[PDB]
């Protein structure tokens, strides 16, 4: 095996076509399916893999009760091929309530954070064995991307945060070669709160679109140089902001150099990537709740501040259905790098009081240079047919 480099250009994207759907919640009503949250897709050179933070229990289980807590000792990173539901034969590759997984072309690297909130330890498991570990440096909740990391020429970069979820936090970018942390760069630039990044390879570097839980409904951008370990940071230029909660389309704004201070007190994991001067971004249709999901391109939305000329809008999940975390992952094609994204379809407690569990499904969409149609691909599970 050779080190995966991502040297091909980005594929032409005219939109996104459906790629995968697990139907996990629908299958949970008639089988042993893991309770999961915060899923992501990461691909090795041959095939793509599902990842999720299991809750240590199945849905039709007494332990699925009150599975809405983010950090428990029983949370493990589940891993199987994309399209295979998280059944009892699923492999829990590590203990983690925060995770990030990437393939360098030779072996899988898993960054897994578990332990106490104030004294968390992040384990760096490469090729199935623990190679390195770090402790919490701010003595607050240490976390990571909750999505795939990016390895360029054997150097994997992961964005880790440790600090306040509603204030200043110490975000560090960790550079990892074969599981060993060779460098650590603090976040530098205009972004004032970076967490839960969706990182994609933009050769020769790594571009991450993160989530601002402090002050911005516009998404921070982190540009990682994997050679000299330098970090630049800004915000997405488009005036159509991708974080929720947010202002409506006519009142939202972004100026690429600071948080917009427009319902920036929270956020959701999302994604964005640049197609030249334009930006392809996905966001929930609901401005307040994580209900629905849409993707569109903003013309000059990456270079021109406060750009609101949107085009090629696709409804991934309609308004009336719950969405959740979304993230980007890249696939090496024959001649170019394709940008694909997943959407988490959260179901259960904290919005739906008909059941005691909180699990999710995933729907995956890959960028396409051809044509496509419309449609909605929600969870599809009747909450009245599920076990309580």
């Amino acid at each position: 095996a050779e080190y995966r480099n991502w040297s091909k250009p980005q594929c032409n994207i005219t939109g996104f076509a459906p790629f995968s759907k697990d139907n996990s919640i629908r299958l949970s009503a008639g089988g042993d399916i893991w309770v999961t949250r915060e899923p992501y897709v990461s691909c090795d050179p041959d095939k793509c893999y599902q990842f999720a933070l299991g809750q240590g229990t199945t849905l039709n289980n007494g332990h699925s009760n009150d599975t809405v807590h983010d950090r428990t000792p029983y949370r493990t990173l589940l891993m199987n091929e994309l399209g295979v539901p998280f059944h009892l034969g699923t492999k829990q590759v590590c203990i983690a309530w925060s995770s990030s997984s990437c393939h360098d072309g030779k072996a899988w690297l898993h960054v897994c954070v578990t332990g106490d909130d104030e004294n968390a330890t992040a384990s760096f498991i490469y090729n199935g064995r623990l190679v390195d570990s770090i402790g919490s440096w701010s003595k607050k909740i240490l976390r990571t991307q909750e999505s795939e990391c990016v390895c360029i020429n054997g150097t994997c970069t992961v964005v880790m945060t440790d600090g306040s979820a509603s204030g200043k936090a110490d975000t560090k970018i960790l550079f990892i070669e074969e599981g060993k942390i060779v460098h650590t760069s603090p976040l530098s630039g205009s972004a004032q709160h970076v967490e839960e990044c969706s990182c994609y390879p933009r050769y020769p570097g790594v571009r991450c679109v993160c989530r601002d839980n402090w002050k911005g409904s516009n998404r921070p951008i982190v540009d990682i140089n994997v050679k000299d370990y330098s970090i630049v940071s800004s915000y997405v230029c488009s005036g159509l902001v991708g974080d929720t909660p947010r202002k409506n389309d006519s009142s939202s704004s972004s100026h690429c150099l600071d948080p917009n201070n427009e319902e920036g007190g929270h956020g959701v994991k999302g994604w964005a990537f640049d197609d030249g001067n334009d930006v392809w971004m996905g966001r929930t249709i609901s401005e307040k709740l994580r209900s629905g999901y849409e993707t569109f391109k903003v013309i000059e939305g990456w270079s021109k501040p406060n750009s609101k000329l949107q085009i090629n809008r696709q409804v991934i999940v309609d308004r009336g259905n719950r969405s959740g975390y979304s993230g980007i992952f890249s696939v090496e094609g024959k001649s170019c790098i394709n940008r694909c994204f997943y959407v988490e379809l959260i179901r259960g407690r904290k919005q739906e009081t008909e059941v005691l569990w909180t699990s999710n499904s995933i729907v995956v969409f890959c960028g396409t240079s051809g044509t496509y149609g419309t449609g909605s691909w929600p969870d599809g599970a009747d909450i009245n047919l599920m076990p309580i």
Epitope: G189, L257, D258, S303
Partner: antibody
Framework: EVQLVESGGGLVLPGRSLRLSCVAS????????MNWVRQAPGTGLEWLSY????????YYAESVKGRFTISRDNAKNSLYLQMNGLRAEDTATYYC????????????????????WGQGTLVTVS | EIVLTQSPGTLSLSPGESATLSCRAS???????LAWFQQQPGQAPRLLIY???SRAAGIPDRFSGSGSGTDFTLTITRLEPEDFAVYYC??????????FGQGTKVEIKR
């Protein structure tokens, strides 16, 4: 043209207070970030304070943190530096600098710098 | 904190020659956040190169910036009498202590 004129300064006694004013002209004041840079006589440039376009984000140098206080009035296009507890080490020419951002489409990541500097104001603490 | 260190604290060159000024960052600094300023003995600082590689408006092609990470360089080919000043490299935009370099004076050698 973009111009910044620093006011205030003069002669002050140690432990007193001063309020420099940087009046901006030729650009939308609220859209750019403002910085205070002082240069002691015979010494290099020293960056002191930073303020965002709306004043929410403010940074201070370790030397002047707690004593100095930066503020701005976007309606009056004015940048203020309220100094407190002045010492002899605060004798310097104080510059008001505006941050500028250039996209740099080759890199695509918004190079950020201080471009427009005023002629400065001399503050002597004695 | 990024601490910038200009290596040639004082430089002695001759008109028409090429001067090379270096700025060293304590940690890896992005090129986007390094700028070069030229200050005459009785004038305000003037921005020459921003982004460590791109000349400012009105700056002649004499000045050329380069470098990334921890090493940044300023090149002044075909020196002129107005190019003998104090040159500062500043880290701005990366981390809140936006400090300047200690400065580099370019002098006429005789």
């Amino acid at each position: 043209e973009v111009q910044l004129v620093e006011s205030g300064g003069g002669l002050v006694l140690p432990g007193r207070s001063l309020r420099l004013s940087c009046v901006a002209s030729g650009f939308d004041f609220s859209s750019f970030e403002m910085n205070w840079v002082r240069q002691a006589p015979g010494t290099g440039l020293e960056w002191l304070s930073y303020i965002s376009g709306n004043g929410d984000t403010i940074y201070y140098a370790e030397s002047v943190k707690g004593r100095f206080t930066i503020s701005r009035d976007n309606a009056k296009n004015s940048l203020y530096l309220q100094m407190n507890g002045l010492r002899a080490e605060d004798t310097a020419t104080y510059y008001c600098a505006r941050q500028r951002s250039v996209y740099s489409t080759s890199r695509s990541n918004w190079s950020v710098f201080l471009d427009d500097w005023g002629q400065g104001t001399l503050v002597t603490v004695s | 904190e990024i601490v910038l260190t200009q290596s040639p604290g004082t430089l002695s060159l001759s008109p028409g020659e090429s001067a090379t000024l270096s700025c060293r960052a304590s940690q890896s600094l992005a090129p986007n956040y390094l700028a070069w300023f030229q200050q005459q003995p009785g004038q305000a600082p003037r921005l020459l190169i921003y982004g460590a590689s791109s000349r400012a408006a009105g700056i002649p092609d004499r000045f050329s910036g380069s470098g990334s990470g921890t090493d940044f360089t300023l090149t002044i080919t075909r020196l002129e009498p107005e190019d003998f000043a104090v040159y500062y490299c500043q880290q701005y935009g990366g981390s809140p202590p936006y400090t300047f370099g200690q400065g580099t004076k370019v002098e006429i050698k005789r």
